[PDB]
Amino acid sequence: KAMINLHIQKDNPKIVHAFDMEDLGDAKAVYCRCWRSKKFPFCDGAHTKHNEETGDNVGPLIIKKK
Amino acid sequence: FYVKDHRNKAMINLHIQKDNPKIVHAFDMEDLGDAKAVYCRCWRSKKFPFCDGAHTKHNEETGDNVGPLIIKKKET
Ligand code: FES
Ligand code: FES
């Protein structure tokens, strides 16, 4: 079975991010679930290239106010 | 049965909602649905988009190092 993350922070044995929305000034955050973003843990659109290259259908998690 | 899978070996999501061409979730920043959430980034959770600890077995089986995203919601 293949790894999901190829290159990101490989000296960390399990990559977890924790954020408190109280701390944010913005109304929206877009988080990467594909492990291909160059701005991980944030989405930079790299998922579209991944989906085309591999036939996948992954995309980000968005946290936002109405 | 098949003992070969000719899909691209680099595919991340193997089984989840394959009728959806791009799986995106959007949740409230405010505590309208929960106080805190732990979101799956490995596409192996049976509770996707929430983490159920499946990442542990995935990391063990593949040598990977992926884990979840923890979001504490803004209390109103
Ligand atoms: S860059 Fe990874 S989900 Fe968008
Ligand atoms: S079950 Fe997928 S990151 Fe925990």
Q: Characterize A39-60 residue by residue with b for buried, 16 or more Cβ atoms within 10 angstroms of its Cβ, and e for exposed.
A: ebbebebbbeebbeebebbbbb
Distance from CA of A8 to the nearest CA of B (A): 9
The experimental method behind these coordinates is X-ray
Domain of residue B6, residue span: 1-76
Q: Tally the domains of chain B.
A: 1
> DSSP secondary-structure letter at B30?
B
Q: Which tokens go with A62?
A: 């968005």
Query: What's the B47 CA to ligand 2 centre distance in angstroms?
Result: 9
Instruction: Please give the Cα distance from B65 to B59 (Å, whole number).
Output: 6
Do A21 and B71 count as a contact with CB atoms less than 8 A apart? yes
Distance from CA of B37 to the nearest CA of A (A): 10
Q: How far apart are the first and last CA of chain B?
A: 52
Q: How many CB atoms lie within 10 A of CB B72?
A: 16
- Yes or no: say if B46 and B54 are a contact pair by the CB < 8 Å rule: yes
Indicate the resolution in Å.
1.2
